[PDB]
């Protein structure tokens, strides 16, 4: 006879793979599961499942809990106001989350995998990516865009390829808006929506010396905020370009030529 019959009386009190899948569908979707009573933090797995199967379902529900915690974090960060670079970072995180959601939905609807080992081997890449995103969001609520790009360029030097790829994607999405700020300041002299992420700032804090800015020129050039990928001479040139543009538009009244 088959080996299944030899071990049949040993697992007569276990859950078949069908209900296992039917309820892991609910559990990984952050929804409640009747077979596995799911708490906000605890999966609360019954003891009927073997211990090695318990470990594999622990990994699966770890992926599910990473997804749920990433959803909680993205909801929290969406409820808070952030810089447009942080907005694009949140957009990238939500894109990764919805891609993983579509992936697991295709896995559930298709159901081509028959061995949970090969299933875990297939989903291991997405599990690692979700773990990376959680490791990143652990300190996301603290660092600014400059430290963001620093860590991204660092991880682009990492020996791994997935971390380097994600870091490059986020670096590009942030440097797009950085170049947008640069172009805004270079074309109109505008510090609008910079969120302090720009090395030139406006300083109207006067102590009585030229309160009307007849000669004060209330513009400051922060050398420390100048990133490494731009020379200090070029940053000073950009600052002087913007300052001279504002000087022509406000003092010289050369509206047409400046326009």
């Amino acid at each position: 006879v088959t080996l299944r019959q030899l071990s049949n009386p040993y697992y007569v009190n276990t859950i078949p793979e069908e209900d296992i899948l039917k309820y892991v569908s609910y559990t990984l979707l952050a929804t409640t599961s009747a077979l596995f009573p799911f708490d906000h933090e605890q999966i609360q797995i019954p003891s009927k499942i073997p211990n090695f199967e318990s470990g594999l379902l622990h990994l699966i529900f770890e992926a599910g809990l990473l997804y749920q915690s990433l959803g909680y974090k993205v909801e929290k960060f969406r409820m808070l106001n952030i810089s447009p670079m942080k907005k694009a970072l949140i957009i990238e995180i939500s894109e990764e989350l919805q891609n993983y959601t579509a992936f697991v939905n295709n896995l559930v609807s298709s159901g081509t995998v028959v061995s949970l080992k090969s299933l875990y081997r297939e989903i291991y890449e997405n599990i690692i990516r979700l773990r990376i995103y959680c490791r990143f969001t652990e300190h996301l609520e603290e660092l600014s865009g400059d430290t963001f790009l620093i860590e991204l360029n660092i991880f682009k030097s990492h020996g791994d390829l997935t971390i380097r790829k994600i870091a490059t994607n986020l670096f590009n999405s942030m440097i797009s808006l950085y170049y947008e700020y640069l172009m805004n300041w270079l074309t109109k002299g505008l510090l609008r929506a910079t969120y302090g992420e720009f090395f030139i700032a406006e300083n109207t804090d006067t102590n009585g010396t030229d309160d009307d800015f007849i000669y004060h020129i209330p513009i400051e050039f922060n050398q420390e905020r100048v990133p490494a990928f731009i020379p200090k001479e070029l940053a000073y040139k950009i600052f002087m370009i913007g300052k001279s543009y504002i000087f022509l538009e406000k003092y010289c009244k050369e509206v047409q030529w400046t326009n």
Binding site: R135, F136, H139, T147, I150, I154, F155
Partner: protein, 88 residues
């Protein structure tokens, strides 16, 4: 035969080169000693992976602390079972 005598031109050019080399090395050691050997006393740190604090160890301590209790608890249970089964 007999051991050949060391050449005269050879010893002359050798003493000349050796005098020149002694002078050159003295002058080089006199001129600030450009030769140096250093030891690397610096390491890079990458904030996102750089641990904000090692206090997690004590945290892990607490964690292991809890685990300790569990072991004890389990031990007790096993004892009971043993005794129970022993009575059987």
């Amino acid at each position: 035969d007999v051991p050949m005598s060391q050449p005269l031109k050879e010893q002359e050019v050798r003493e000349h080169q050796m005098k020149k080399e002694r002078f050159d090395r003295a002058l080089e050691s006199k001129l600030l000693g450009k030769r140096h050997i250093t030891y690397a006393n610096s390491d890079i740190s990458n904030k996102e992976l750089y641990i904000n604090e090692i206090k997690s160890l004590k945290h892990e301590i607490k964690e292991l602390r809890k685990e300790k209790n569990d072991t004890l608890n389990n031990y007790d249970t096993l004892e009971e079972e043993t005794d129970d089964l022993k009575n059987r």
